[PDB]
Amino acid sequence: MFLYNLTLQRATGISFAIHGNFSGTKQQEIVVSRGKILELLRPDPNTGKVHTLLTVEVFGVIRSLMAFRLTGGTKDYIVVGSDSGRIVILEYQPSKNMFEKIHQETFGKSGCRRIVPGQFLAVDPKGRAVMISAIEKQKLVYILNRDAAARLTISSPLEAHKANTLVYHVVGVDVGFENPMFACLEMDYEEADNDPTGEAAANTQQTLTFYELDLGLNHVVRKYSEPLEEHGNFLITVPGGSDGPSGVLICSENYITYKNFGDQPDIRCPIPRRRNDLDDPERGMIFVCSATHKTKSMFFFLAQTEQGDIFKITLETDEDMVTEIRLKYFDTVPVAAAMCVLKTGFLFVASEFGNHYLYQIAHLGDDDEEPEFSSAMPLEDTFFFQPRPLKNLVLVDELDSLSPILFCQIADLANEDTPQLYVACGRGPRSSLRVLRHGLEVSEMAVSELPGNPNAVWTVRRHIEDEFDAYIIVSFVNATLVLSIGETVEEVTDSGFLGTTPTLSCSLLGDDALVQVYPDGIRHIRADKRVNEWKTPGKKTIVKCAVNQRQVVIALTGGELVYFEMDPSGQLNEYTERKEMSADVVCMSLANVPPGEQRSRFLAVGLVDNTVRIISLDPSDCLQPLSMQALPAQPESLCIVEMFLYLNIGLQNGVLLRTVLDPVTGDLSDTRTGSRPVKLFRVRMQGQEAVLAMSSRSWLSYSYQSRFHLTPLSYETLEFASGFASEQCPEGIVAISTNTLRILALEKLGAVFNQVAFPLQYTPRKFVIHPESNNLIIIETDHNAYTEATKAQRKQQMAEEMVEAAGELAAEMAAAFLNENLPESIFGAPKAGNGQWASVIRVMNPIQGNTLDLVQLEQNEAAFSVAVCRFSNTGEDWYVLVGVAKDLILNPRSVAGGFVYTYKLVNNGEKLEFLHKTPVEEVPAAIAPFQGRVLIGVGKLLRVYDLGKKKLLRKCENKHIANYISGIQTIGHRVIVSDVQESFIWVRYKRNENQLIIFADDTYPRWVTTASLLDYDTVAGADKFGNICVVRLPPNTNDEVDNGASQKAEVIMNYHVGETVLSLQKTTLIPGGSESLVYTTLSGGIGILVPFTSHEDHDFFQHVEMHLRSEHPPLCGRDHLSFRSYYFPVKNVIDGDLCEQFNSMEPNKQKNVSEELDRTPPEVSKKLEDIRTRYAF
Amino acid sequence: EMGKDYIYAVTPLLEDALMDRDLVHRQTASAVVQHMSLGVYGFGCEDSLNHLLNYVWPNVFETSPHVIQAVMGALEGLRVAIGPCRMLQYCLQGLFHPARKVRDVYWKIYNSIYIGSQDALIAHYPRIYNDDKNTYIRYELDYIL
Amino acid sequence: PDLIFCRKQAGVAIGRLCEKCDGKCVICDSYVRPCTLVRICDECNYGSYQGRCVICGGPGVSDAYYCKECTIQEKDRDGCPKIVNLGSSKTDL
Ligand SMILES: [Zn+2]
Ligand SMILES: [Zn+2]
Ligand SMILES: [Zn+2]
């Protein structure tokens, strides 16, 4: 087996977000880090939308990310810390739209190691030094400089190592043009390792250390070191120099502290708490992230707690000492991984899970009566505030994110013919079930139907500079209904078209001239309503026409084209010559004339005999051929279009051809998109040109950032279309369906996928599909959680212990506490407990999202398994089995037992009826229907259960699986069992002796997350660490036998993906395509693994990958082969994400690589597109 | 990388040479194994190289300097070609052997495997159980979603 | 032989080779596939030592490289690879 790796939807989770002037202008951008992807975003201040400018794969692990600039510069640089032993400095080039690598310095070995730096990045605020640090013992400092050409300069590093020391966070200190300083949170562990009593581990303190870099003497001095009262997470740089003092804020548990070296005393402020908090009273509070904003007059900090509450922080000063810290509740947002405050008053929030948000800061300097808290207030007890809806922020934009994907299913549950992706996403009270379709989300704006079978429709303006449309010529086969535009749709009469005849052409030729064409001749009507009735002699019927702004060329029966032309005056000029050809035409058209020059000269004509031919219209070479090309079948429509000029041939079978247009048609690309004829129509997109292919499916060709796309419509069948410009839709498509007349719109240009979301209560773990009704059965579970009954009773109990305060009782806060409830999707779920759980079973319709049934389990019960099945001892009834753990502790692990619930699943799969509850001695973690019975993994044991009258009855058991059963898979009488730490184990069921027998296992340990059966002898698996593998039994394997087993399975495929996969499925994604192996990650990514067809295909892609590994090496200093061999060496997988970076290289490198491969760059690009469209889109 | 089609043809000669009384035979054969394993890396000859590792390993108990230096280089090349997992599986036998000589040799081999690919070993360590006083199980890796 | 490696943190200076040992790997003495450029530390590139051969110390006329095998095994990620003579002094051989 030989496979090829292709990403369909890149990851959407965010790890780091920085902001600066990266293009060099006055705009501000945001550089975000996905896991192994670097991205550049630009939010528009006038619309509040965020756009993606650039996305690059770095083939590594980004661990830290900082920005800086030098004194006097107007452009910001990027420093990256990664899992290469290197530090890289990047610069954005707007004219090329790429990241250029400026510098790269090597200091150690690869991998996320413990004593090699790369985890922490600190930069001097004036931009003349950068520190990079490991979690243990090793720190390096580089000095940044400039030459007379204003080019960056990096020096040899200086060491700041310290043995037996742990680092928590490193930050650069803002001194103003003095020597640079860095501040770290440290912890020496040398004495806790020598004390058997364990009380050197206790009362070991965290210190704050200041490192000073002497620029004139070129060495590092440890300047100050002070122990702290309690342990802290991250530090914050306070703006110094002339705009403030120069210290740090230490964020700890329950406190925030200000410190500085010298005569400055420490100032502490406790973190305020929510009043009437339903959380667990034993938990503390920390800050999770922060953001600084510095105006010319003042500065403030924004800081967020574990519950999502943002606090505004300010400092009261004297000449140079800080005296007070003030805190004040700002707003509540979802918990963020990072947040940026932009100039122009916008707050970007990158959430740690789910969708991202852009807010507009409406209020700063507060005109409200909420209380402020301060470190100077005497307190014996803590502060208390009341959360409330958004007051200072206004939501403006929202970025979709699939992270984290916990379970996926590819099926066609809606009765379309393409499959859909049913994805269980999200975390906690922000979880949801999302349906993904391939195509473009259309925005339906108007729908109306009139009797008739409209075979054609146009959309005309009445003079050239109109910004909206004028008429809607909906013409049937024998009649024509001309309508108008008034936002009040009318049937216009004075149009002058007078269509008693069916209309086949309508366009805007002159200054204000309309031209209607019909099989009975041509009718030119300008602002003067008088008929210039042109007719074709005899009885010969015009078949089709072609129009433009300056020329109206026709052809009647026999192929006698009649070239016209519009003089600058406004009347036609019949040409002297009239051309013929061998056979009549089945299509013809001509290019649009620009407003610069006079008119067109190219004119394409297609024939029924499987040939299309180009005819010139040069006044010096009128009606003389230039190019003739044949087709596998006859076409139906052409479209000579821009967006380098192109030409779109639409064959009348289910294939679309696109070629480059020139007197020599060289390129041509195919996409068979079918089951119906292909009609082509020209429309507008993003102010640019676009084409609209139409078949059983309706597609749309368009360019976006100099990049062609061919994406279908997530819609039903159309028949005809056009552009549309009105106050209703300035950018619309007046589509006509069978027995209807619709008006649509589309405003999404990228977006390979298109989604709809259905909210959920807890985190989803698994779902199954009911075969009869196609309903979903979902189990949702959360650790650290309350059930609804527990919450209600806790609220009641708190209310009465409030109402017993014995103090004038006349003013009761209890009645207001009991009635108001904060929505948990906004304010968060009350995380309270350690061994506390909360589960739910949900039956859901997948078409709409309505819940049909809901079961709520008791408090400390956690559902981990679900199956829907039939039992052979009963009839054709269905059953739902859920496995639950009872009182589970995660660290250290311990349970009290388990249960398996059985429900009856009645009313066409709409209702669960409880049947019984069977106790087991461990977590039932897997459930698989197996030959009229069920297989259940109970901790370490594999069992067969049958359905009894009062419980499930055990029939057979095997007790030789190693640790813990996470999955069970079945085919025939074969059982594949996944272990938590070992790989797959193979088991056979002997019916006649009632035995479960192990007959094979693996030679490697694998932390298995998911598994999928490929055939009777082959399993694909995924790991906790980011690898995919394929394991196959040798052909000599004896199924009937009696370190673990003698027979061993062979590994035939190994690949490091970079993200943790939790879903694998073998399926076909497009109609008329081949089978792929689809996977989804925890970061929101969707990728495929596809086979090669011949040896010659596999040798070509191998050479491409081998040459790009050396000429286009990864951006952060990683080795590609080394990154794909992270835990095991790569085996039999080509990386098409690297292979497809060929299309982003510079023409010099493209030329060199194509010379090496003995081809042309257009030929290399076409082979890449061919394998992609064969399996995926 | 052209030598990936010719490992099976040469393995019998190397099997004879790695079991031989002459020390120079074994030294040169280990050099061959090292260059083969580093030359084919990322092409899938793990079966052939595992077979050869079985014949390289018995020579780690060698008192001669140049021979033991050739054997260590062959082992470091086979680390790259085969994976740190198989090397750790071979090495876990004698880290706590009663014999101090076995312990010396095995800790040398383990220290090589540890300095090269320290981060890949997080996935390959075996499960060690809690005793009375100390906790040795890693529970996060036992979490199930 | 009283010869060790320097093994200090290497900086931005580039190692040189004399014309005798010109195309060799500074680590394994091989001639096959020079891959990665050699960096030396700031002390080993100073004053009269500027531009001398990494291997022997003679006048340098070309750049020093790591071979492909050493790059694959990540032997370029240790310290400065200059050869130090412990049996003699600074201005000695
Ligand atoms: Zn070498
Ligand atoms: Zn040195
Ligand atoms: Zn020399």
Tab-separated table of N, CA, C and O in Angstrom, chain A residues 185 206 230-236 248-257 271 286-290 303 313:
chain	number	residue	atom	x	y	z
A	185	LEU	N	9.922	33.923	36.415
A	185	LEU	CA	9.429	33.206	37.588
A	185	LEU	C	10.140	31.860	37.664
A	185	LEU	O	9.975	31.015	36.783
A	206	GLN	N	8.807	30.201	45.183
A	206	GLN	CA	9.035	30.751	43.859
A	206	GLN	C	9.697	32.121	43.967
A	206	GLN	O	9.312	32.959	44.780
A	230	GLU	N	3.065	33.693	47.318
A	230	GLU	CA	2.427	32.528	46.724
A	230	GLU	C	2.891	32.370	45.283
A	230	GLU	O	3.379	33.312	44.657
A	231	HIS	N	2.732	31.159	44.761
A	231	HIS	CA	3.167	30.857	43.406
A	231	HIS	C	2.305	31.586	42.388
A	231	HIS	O	1.090	31.709	42.542
A	232	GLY	N	2.947	32.061	41.332
A	232	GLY	CA	2.246	32.744	40.270
A	232	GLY	C	2.451	32.086	38.924
A	232	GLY	O	3.481	31.480	38.650
A	233	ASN	N	1.424	32.195	38.091
A	233	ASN	CA	1.571	32.039	36.652
A	233	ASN	C	1.973	33.397	36.090
A	233	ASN	O	2.486	34.238	36.831
A	234	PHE	N	1.742	33.628	34.806
A	234	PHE	CA	2.435	34.619	33.985
A	234	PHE	C	2.643	36.021	34.557
A	234	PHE	O	1.998	36.432	35.522
A	235	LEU	N	3.589	36.745	33.962
A	235	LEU	CA	3.914	38.130	34.268
A	235	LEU	C	3.377	39.062	33.191
A	235	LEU	O	3.037	38.637	32.088
A	236	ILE	N	3.323	40.355	33.520
A	236	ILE	CA	2.898	41.397	32.590
A	236	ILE	C	3.872	42.567	32.652
A	236	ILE	O	4.180	43.084	33.726
A	248	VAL	N	6.673	44.897	36.848
A	248	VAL	CA	5.886	43.789	36.333
A	248	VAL	C	4.684	43.580	37.238
A	248	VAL	O	4.701	43.908	38.422
A	249	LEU	N	3.629	43.034	36.657
A	249	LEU	CA	2.483	42.545	37.403
A	249	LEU	C	2.587	41.028	37.476
A	249	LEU	O	2.756	40.370	36.448
A	250	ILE	N	2.523	40.485	38.685
A	250	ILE	CA	2.585	39.044	38.905
A	250	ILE	C	1.168	38.547	39.139
A	250	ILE	O	0.519	38.930	40.118
A	251	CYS	N	0.686	37.691	38.251
A	251	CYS	CA	-0.630	37.088	38.397
A	251	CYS	C	-0.505	35.781	39.166
A	251	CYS	O	0.184	34.861	38.725
A	252	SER	N	-1.166	35.708	40.311
A	252	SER	CA	-1.147	34.538	41.175
A	252	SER	C	-2.563	33.999	41.334
A	252	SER	O	-3.505	34.457	40.686
A	253	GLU	N	-2.712	33.024	42.218
A	253	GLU	CA	-4.029	32.536	42.602
A	253	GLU	C	-4.618	33.491	43.631
A	253	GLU	O	-4.033	33.704	44.695
A	254	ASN	N	-5.763	34.080	43.297
A	254	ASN	CA	-6.583	34.966	44.116
A	254	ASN	C	-6.011	36.372	44.253
A	254	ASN	O	-6.667	37.213	44.858
A	255	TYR	N	-4.827	36.662	43.717
A	255	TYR	CA	-4.221	37.972	43.887
A	255	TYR	C	-3.571	38.423	42.591
A	255	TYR	O	-3.322	37.629	41.686
A	256	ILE	N	-3.303	39.721	42.520
A	256	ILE	CA	-2.400	40.295	41.531
A	256	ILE	C	-1.466	41.246	42.270
A	256	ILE	O	-1.891	41.969	43.175
A	257	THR	N	-0.185	41.216	41.913
A	257	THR	CA	0.846	41.922	42.658
A	257	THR	C	1.674	42.777	41.716
A	257	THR	O	1.971	42.366	40.595
A	271	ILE	N	-8.415	39.336	43.807
A	271	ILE	CA	-9.287	39.256	42.641
A	271	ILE	C	-10.733	39.222	43.119
A	271	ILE	O	-11.071	38.422	43.998
A	286	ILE	N	-7.623	32.179	38.971
A	286	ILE	CA	-6.438	32.713	38.317
A	286	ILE	C	-6.873	33.530	37.109
A	286	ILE	O	-8.001	33.427	36.630
A	287	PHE	N	-5.951	34.356	36.624
A	287	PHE	CA	-6.095	34.995	35.326
A	287	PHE	C	-5.543	34.075	34.243
A	287	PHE	O	-4.487	33.463	34.403
A	288	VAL	N	-6.255	33.991	33.125
A	288	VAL	CA	-5.842	33.123	32.038
A	288	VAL	C	-5.137	33.873	30.910
A	288	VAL	O	-4.328	33.268	30.202
A	289	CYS	N	-5.411	35.163	30.717
A	289	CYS	CA	-4.771	35.923	29.651
A	289	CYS	C	-4.871	37.410	29.959
A	289	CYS	O	-5.535	37.826	30.909
A	290	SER	N	-4.191	38.213	29.143
A	290	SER	CA	-4.104	39.646	29.374
A	290	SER	C	-3.849	40.367	28.058
A	290	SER	O	-3.462	39.763	27.058
A	303	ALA	N	-7.690	41.932	31.675
A	303	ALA	CA	-7.330	40.617	32.186
A	303	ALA	C	-8.576	39.778	32.405
A	303	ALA	O	-9.582	40.277	32.908
A	313	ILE	N	-7.695	47.130	34.558
A	313	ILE	CA	-6.705	47.363	35.604
A	313	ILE	C	-5.973	48.667	35.320
A	313	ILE	O	-5.519	48.896	34.196
